[PDB]
Amino acid sequence: MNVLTTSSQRGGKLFKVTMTLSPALSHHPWPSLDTYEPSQNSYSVVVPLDRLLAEMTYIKNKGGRVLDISPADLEALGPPDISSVAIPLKVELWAKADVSDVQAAIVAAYKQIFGNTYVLESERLTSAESLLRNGSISVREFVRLLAKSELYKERFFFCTSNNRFTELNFKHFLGRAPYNQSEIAAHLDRYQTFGYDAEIDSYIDSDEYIQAFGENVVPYYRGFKSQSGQTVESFNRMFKLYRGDAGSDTNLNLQGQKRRVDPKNLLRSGRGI
Amino acid sequence: RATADGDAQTKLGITAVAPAQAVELRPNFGETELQAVIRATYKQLFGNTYILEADRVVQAESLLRNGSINVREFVRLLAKSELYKERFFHCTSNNRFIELTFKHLLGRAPYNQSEFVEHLDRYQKSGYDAEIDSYIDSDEYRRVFGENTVPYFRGFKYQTGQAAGVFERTLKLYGGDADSDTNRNRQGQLRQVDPQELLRSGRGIV
Ligand SMILES: *[C@H](C)[C@H]1/C(=C/c2[nH]c(/C=C3N=C(/C=C4\NC(=O)C(CC)=C4C)C(C)=C\3CCC(=O)O)c(CCC(=O)O)c2C)NC(=O)[C@@H]1C
Ligand SMILES: *[C@H](C)[C@H]1/C(=C/c2[nH]c(/C=C3N=C(/C=C4\NC(=O)C(CC)=C4C)C(C)=C\3CCC(=O)O)c(CCC(=O)O)c2C)NC(=O)[C@@H]1C
Ligand SMILES: *[C@H](C)[C@H]1/C(=C/c2[nH]c(/C=C3N=C(/C=C4\NC(=O)C(CC)=C4C)C(C)=C\3CCC(=O)O)c(CCC(=O)O)c2C)NC(=O)[C@@H]1C
Ligand SMILES: *[C@H](C)[C@H]1/C(=C/c2[nH]c(/C=C3N=C(/C=C4\NC(=O)C(CC)=C4C)C(C)=C\3CCC(=O)O)c(CCC(=O)O)c2C)NC(=O)[C@@H]1C
Ligand SMILES: *[C@H](C)[C@H]1/C(=C/c2[nH]c(/C=C3N=C(/C=C4\NC(=O)C(CC)=C4C)C(C)=C\3CCC(=O)O)c(CCC(=O)O)c2C)NC(=O)[C@@H]1C
């Protein structure tokens, strides 16, 4: 929830704690068994640094358990601006492209395909670049080479779970976020039998690709602007998947590869199968 | 004998406080529930002393309206406030204040002499503020009226692990629905609980 002040009147960094409540921790003043109120199964309080230790211990000493703690400065921050992704920009590689224009497509392709993740000079792929610019490879084919590269597997696929790798793929190859568990499930199965290469192909192969940014257009963010057959929740998901500019997908951070889109949110938009 | 059921309470004047009603704020609140809770807190914390229109604290009430603080936090804000401190803290003695805060933040009176030791040393070591917190923070406050419930008198009803001779002690503190502890009465603010009856309940070393 929103926090209204970052700091306590006495100087002190407020932290927002979230817990699963327990009947002991708060109970209705009724007769009969003690129940907490249902709407507050996940309760949230903002505590100064000083009371934080004691508050957390009390929570834990009862049946409570702490879902997460987060500084109230980071919390109570703007939802990310969508200025740059509202209108993506879009890059076309013409045939008979200049030296420069090919460069600019390469950069754009790295940026989108790898998340703000930085790619070092040793990481970059001379061979696949070499193919673009003398012809022979499409933009769409280059993209398929990137998502086949180890660099791609090391970041997105070898650290995290397939369930996260899926949405992580949905973002890189299509602006969209995932819509409905069905999609996540299908990719998981395809991966088990066909294996990693087939899965990657199936995004680039799919009709959304080609119908949008078909060939020779570096893929750009479609989400954040209304798409056909796209549940509304998907639009909110996009805000979880995409945090700001100069926010990335990093294996490098502490517990680097987690799931932005809670599995219960997917189930909202469509549950079945 | 032919005493009524109520009789024993009505003779003492504890008829309203005995099984006191509990006011809870709920997840989404009507404009009236909010204003009930607010009235009940102010009446219980300040000891039915009269709070004018200027004395009220608007911000705390707003935060309580947004949902940004629970009732338990609202209680701490009131308790940690110029207005409270002026009535029950700066004019009295620490012995007098402890028994007041005990009554305000938990309807009982003080169970024994040790309760005065842990709360007086606490105050010298750390602030007033840390002391006040230790009350709301304590498990007994959390166990009853832990969150979203206004504190209510627990005195005058058997509570587990009660000491004997709360009942009488709280009767000294309560003294009727029109009584109110008041900084500003003749002969100032003085303890009602006599110190020899404390020792009457155990007194260990420290
Ligand atoms: C009974 C028909 C089925 C069932 C119920 C069941 N519920 C719990 C635990 C809780 N149920 C609730 C429900 C509410 N709390 C509220 O305040 C309200 C109204 C405002 C409701 C309806 C809550 C919050 C709890 C958890 C905490 C509590 O005790 O209040 C259980 C026990 C769960 C446990 O493992 O502790 C059960 C069994 N489940 C069944 O078996 C039936 C199908
Ligand atoms: C079998 C021992 C028990 C069982 C399994 C079960 N799982 C599902 C459905 C899914 N399982 C997953 C989990 C994963 N996500 C990942 O990334 C990985 C690899 C690290 C796994 C294992 C997912 C995503 C699904 C969703 C659908 C799918 O098939 O992918 C089911 C089907 C039920 C459902 O879809 O609602 C089942 C049965 N559950 C049991 O009953 C067994 C005890
Ligand atoms: C240097 C002054 C300090 C420092 C920096 C540092 N940064 C990273 C990693 C990242 N830094 C960023 C930064 C940005 N992303 C953006 O897009 C922008 C603006 C557009 C910025 C400024 C990002 C995205 C990352 C993550 C990806 C990456 O691999 O860099 C590190 C490395 C973190 C790691 O554990 O690998 C470091 C060291 N840290 C210091 O030591 C200096 C105080
Ligand atoms: C007015 C007709 C006359 C008057 C009255 C008067 N009362 C006070 C102060 C208090 N009056 C009460 C009484 C009540 N509390 C209750 O809940 C009830 C009904 C159940 C009553 C009647 C209390 C508790 C106080 C203290 C309030 C506080 O401490 O804030 C005063 C003010 C005296 C003072 O010094 O505070 C006065 C003037 N007195 C007159 O002169 C009028 C003839
Ligand atoms: C039963 C043998 C006899 C009897 C008992 C009786 N007690 C009450 C009311 C109360 N009893 C207590 C007593 C205690 N408080 C304590 O702290 C302890 C242990 C230290 C005890 C034993 C209290 C506080 C009450 C009042 C509050 C409450 O109800 O919990 C009654 C009811 C009288 C009333 O009007 O409340 C009775 C009947 N009386 C008999 O007739 C028996 C001989």
Q: How would DSSP label each residue in B139-172?
A: HHHHHSS-SSB-----TTS--TTPPTTHHHHHHH
Q: What number of H helices and E strands is found in chain A?
A: 12, 6
Query: A29: distance to nearest CA of chain B, Å?
Result: 7
Residue among A165, A190, A191, A189 at smallest CA distance from A178: A165
C-alpha–C-alpha distance, residues A182 and B39, integer Å: 52
Method used experimentally: cryo-EM
Residues in chain A: 273
Which residues are registered as beta bridge partners of A16?
A46, A70
Own/partner pairs, A46-49, CB within 8 angstroms, 24+ separation: A46/A3, A46/A14, A46/A15, A46/A16, A46/A17, A46/A72, A46/B68, A47/A14, A47/A15, A47/A17, A48/A8, A48/A10, A48/A12, A48/A13, A48/A14, A48/A15, A49/A12, A49/A13, A49/A14, A49/A15
**Do residues A257 and A164 touch, judged by C-beta distance below 8 A?**
yes
Is residue A75 helix, strand or coil?
coil
Burial B85-109 (b: 16+ CB within 10 A, else e): bebbbeebeeebbbbbbbbbbbbbb
Write the residue in B27, B73, B129 that is nearest to A39 by C-beta.
B27
How many Cβ atoms sit within 10 Å of the Cβ of residue B132?
22
C-alpha–C-alpha distance, residues A40 and A238, integer Å: 26
**Which residue is it, tokens 């497509």?**
A105
Please calculate the CA angle A214-A220-A223 and round it to the nearest 5 degrees: 105
Report resolution (Å) to 1 decimal: 3.0
Joined together, the tokens standing for residue B161 give 């692990």
Query: Residue B91, by phi and psi: left (phi above 0), alpha (psi -120 to 50) or beta?
Result: alpha
Q: Give A183: exposed, middle or buried? Use CB within 10 Å, 0-12, 13-18, 19+.
A: middle
Query: A59: distance to nearest CA of chain B, Å?
Result: 10
Joined together, the tokens standing for residue A98 give 């200049």
Instruction: Determine which residue's CA is closest to atom 15 belonging to ligand 5.
Output: B158
How many Cβ atoms sit within 10 Å of the Cβ of residue A115?
19
Q: How far is the CA of A195 from the centre of ligand 2 (A)?
A: 18
Give Cβ neighbours of residue A211 (< 8 Å, ≥ 6 apart). Answer: none
